[PDB]
Design a protein around this ligand. Structure first.
Ligand code: HEM
Length: 152
């Protein structure tokens, strides 16, 4: 569903994220929790962080978000050939964290927002399109695994 050119744009933009994973991650979470405060309730520790500055000062949050974006980066670099990487993630997010697909849509929106904020010259319509397709492919495939595990 993505062309080789689309995957190159995805990966071009992701190399930029990789220059500061923690900083992009912090911004993505803050944007998620500002836009969709219900999502914060899924994080037993982070939900007690009262302000954007407390969130940026949390080493726990920073460590966590780097783990998250490392997993996302690994999946993107597979250019759709990501079943083996998705399987465990679907398993923990369906069975333990209980994350609905619409919250993966919310975080997808925050990713696009933060990448456009930081890298507008390397993130125009074609690049936004390709990342949107790549994040949609990730969610569709996670959604299929959710069903196989018996989660709604
Ligand atoms: C790009 C989409 C996401 C990716 C790549 C991702 C990735 C990860 C990874 C690698 C971990 C640690 C291992 C694990 O338990 O599976 C994790 C844990 C976690 N994830 Fe996600 N996640 C995504 C979306 C979300 C969303 C949208 C939420 C909530 C609204 C969520 C909530 C959690 C929670 C609550 C944990 C456990 C944190 C802890 O207490 O240690 N995840 N995620």
């Amino acid at each position: 569903v993505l062309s080789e050119g689309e995957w190159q744009l995805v990966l071009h933009v992701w190399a930029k994220v990789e220059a500061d994973v923690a900083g992009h991650g912090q911004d993505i979470l803050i944007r998620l929790f500002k836009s969709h405060p219900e999502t914060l309730e899924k994080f037993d520790r982070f939900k007690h962080l009262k302000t954007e500055a407390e969130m940026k000062a949390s080493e726990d949050l920073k460590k966590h978000i780097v783990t998250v974006l490392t997993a996302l980066g690994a999946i993107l670099k597979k250019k759709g050939h990501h079943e083996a990487e998705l399987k465990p993630l679907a398993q923990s997010h369906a069975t333990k964290h209980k994350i609905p697909i619409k919250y993966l849509e919310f975080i997808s929106e925050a990713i696009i927002h933060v990448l456009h904020s930081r890298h507008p010259g390397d993130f125009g319509a074609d690049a936004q399109g390709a990342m949107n397709k790549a994040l949609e492919l990730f969610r569709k495939d996670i959604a299929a695994k959710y069903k196989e595990l018996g989660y709604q």
